[PDB]
Amino acid sequence: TAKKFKVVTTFTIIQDIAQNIAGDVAVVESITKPGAEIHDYQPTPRDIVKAQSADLILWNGMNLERWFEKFFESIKDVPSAVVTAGITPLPIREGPYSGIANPHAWMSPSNALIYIENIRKALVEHDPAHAETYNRNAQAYAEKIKALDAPLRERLSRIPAEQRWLVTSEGAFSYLAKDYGFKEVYLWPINAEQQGIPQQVRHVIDIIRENKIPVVFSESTISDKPAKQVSKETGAQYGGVLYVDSLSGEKGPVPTYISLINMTVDTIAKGF
Ligand SMILES: [Mn+2]
Numbered sequence: 001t002a003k004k005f006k007v008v009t010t011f012t013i014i015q016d017i018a019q020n021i022a023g024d025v026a027v028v029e030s031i032t033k034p035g036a037e038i039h040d041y042q043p044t045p046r047d048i049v050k051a052q053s054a055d056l057i058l059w060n061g062m063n064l065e066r067w068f069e070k071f072f073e074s075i076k077d078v079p080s081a082v083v084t085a086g087i088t089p090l091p092i093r094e095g096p097y098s099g100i101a102n103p104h105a106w107m108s109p110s111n112a113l114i115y116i117e118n119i120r121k122a123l124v125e126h127d128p129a130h131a132e133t134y135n136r137n138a139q140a141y142a143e144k145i146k147a148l149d150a151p152l153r154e155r156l157s158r159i160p161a162e163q164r165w166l167v168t169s170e171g172a173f174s175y176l177a178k179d180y181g182f183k184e185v186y187l188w189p190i191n192a193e194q195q196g197i198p199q200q201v202r203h204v205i206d207i208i209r210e211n212k213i214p215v216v217f218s219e220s221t222i223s224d225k226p227a228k229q230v231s232k233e234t235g236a237q238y239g240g241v242l243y244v245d246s247l248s249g250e251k252g253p254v255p256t257y258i259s260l261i262n263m264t265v266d267t268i269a270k271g272f
């Protein structure tokens, strides 16, 4: 056979996690495309029809998708589920969104296990005919995620503790940084139309000076120009691109959530 159970997700990371749980018994599609900015995405009429055709809608919550609640108002009779349920938020530390949840919880692979469980539960509840495929796929995929911890830590193990400074454009790596003992510095705390970046750019250059930070990075859905300037004004090498808010295309270097975590840690590690 019939027309398969259809899941629509707001962005690509959730799409890939959900598709691993769904296997071939459900079809999972993302509203946003690879490479597109997800926080302030502007949905189109095509997007309403796509979401309205789903049997279940998955979104991040933690107000990642500033567009979603207004968007969902146009969708009728389709259940939605927040895939971060039960995750404890790290607060945004500075700027006009200080004190709001940092939404990038998927960058901690231990948090990913909670994403998987929330998605499994939603799939089993709303598609009970395939409960055993979902439960089997979710346990197998959770073991793939747990198996990342040892190679990831080993990959970062050369960098001594007080050299572990991670300097990015968006402050999108706070969950990854807490997991692996890095201190975070960023050019802006969360993607948004905002003031303060040129004054934050001076501050970052300042903090690179004091601590002799060797590398700075950018991310794949935003501009590399601020990070490349900070590298020019310091001696630090420009290390990016890092992946957090989007996968690549299916043929690019980051087609899956696992490849996103691995390539991001790999790129950090080679910068030092
Ligand atoms: Mn439900």
Ligand SMILES: [Mn+2]
Pocket: 039, 104, 170, 172, 191, 245
């Ligand atoms: Mn982001």
